[PDB]
Amino acid sequence: VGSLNCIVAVSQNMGIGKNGDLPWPPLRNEFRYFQRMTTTSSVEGKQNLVIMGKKTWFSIPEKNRPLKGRINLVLSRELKEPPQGAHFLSRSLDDALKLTEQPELANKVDMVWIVGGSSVYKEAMNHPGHLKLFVTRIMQDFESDTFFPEIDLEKYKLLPEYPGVLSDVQEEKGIKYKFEVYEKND
Ligand SMILES: *O=P(*)([O])(O[C][C]1O[C](N2[C]=NC3=C2N=[C]N=C3[N])[C](O(*)P(*)([O])([O])=O)[C]1[O])OP(*)([O])(=O)O[C][C]1O[C](N2[C]=[C][C]C(C([N])=O)=[C]2)[C]([O])[C]1[O]
Numbered sequence: 001v002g003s004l005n006c007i008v009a010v011s012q013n014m015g016i017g018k019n020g021d022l023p024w025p026p027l028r029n030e031f032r033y034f035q036r037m038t039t040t041s042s043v044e045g046k047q048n049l050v051i052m053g054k055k056t057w058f059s060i061p062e063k064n065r066p067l068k069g070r071i072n073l074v075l076s077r078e079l080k081e082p083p084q085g086a087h088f089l090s091r092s093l094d095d096a097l098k099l100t101e102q103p104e105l106a107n108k109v110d111m112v113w114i115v116g117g118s119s120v121y122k123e124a125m126n127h128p129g130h131l132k133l134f135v136t137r138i139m140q141d142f143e144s145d146t147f148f149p150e151i152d153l154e155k156y157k158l159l160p161e162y163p164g165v166l167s168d169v170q171e172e173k174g175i176k177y178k179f180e181v182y183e184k185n186d
């Protein structure tokens with residue numbers, strides 16, 4: 001098993017969701033970036049694993065479920081099996097990561113990507129160890145009901161560059177946004 005990573009897109013007021021969707025109109029290239037980053041596995045013959053909360057799962061439209069070419073693991077304490085389309089179910093982030101060091105997965109999983117929501121992100125970000133955050137900054141306020149947790153810049157350093165990640169400001173349906181990569185190791 002290779003890297004542990006979080007990926008999020010966040011508005012300026014730290015908003016990531018609203019009424020079970022994203023706070024902003026769909027940005028096609030942000031979705032394409034998310035796809036590319038989560039799917040791409042630099043260790044031939046392995047797949048990436050995506051870990052998400054239950055609400056995040058159901059927030060993805062049904063025909064795009066499971067996220068293709070990735071092992072999909074949903075986090076729930078209420079569900080008794082993976083939702084229709086989902087591969088794995090865990091009752092905690094620990095168990096999910098614990099589940100990756102088993103026979104079934106340990107030689108199949110490369111990168112693990114936490115793809116939301118808030119409480120998964122929160123727990124990951126505050127877990128000791130080597131962790132990157134791939135943060136798309138949507139450069140406006142958008143009204144939101146769910147938020148990205150605080151990034152502690154004493155521990156997380158913004159990288160000045162990263163391969164395969166555009167540094168330049170992007171714009172789509174009149175909304176400016178930028179890609180960032182943060183790294184901690186503690
Ligand atoms: O965390 P989300 O996905 O779901 C909450 C639901 O998840 C289960 N949960 C969460 N965390 C754990 C867990 N279960 C076990 N262990 C852990 N650690 C739990 O389900 P149950 O009760 O059945 O056990 C929780 O209730 O939901 P959220 O934070 O409410 O977010 C969804 C919103 O944000 C948007 N979004 C999601 C991901 C990324 C981004 C982004 N912009 O990058 C946005 C969604 O659209 C939605 O609005």
Ligand SMILES: Cc1c(Sc2ccc(C(F)(F)F)cc2)sc2nc(N)nc(N)c12
Nearest residue numbers: 007008009034059060061064115116136
């Ligand atoms: C969960 C998420 C979304 S929600 C979502 C994800 C995928 C799909 C589709 F590819 F299936 F369409 C739809 C909604 S956009 C996005 N962008 C970044 N940078 N990071 C993320 N974690 C997400």
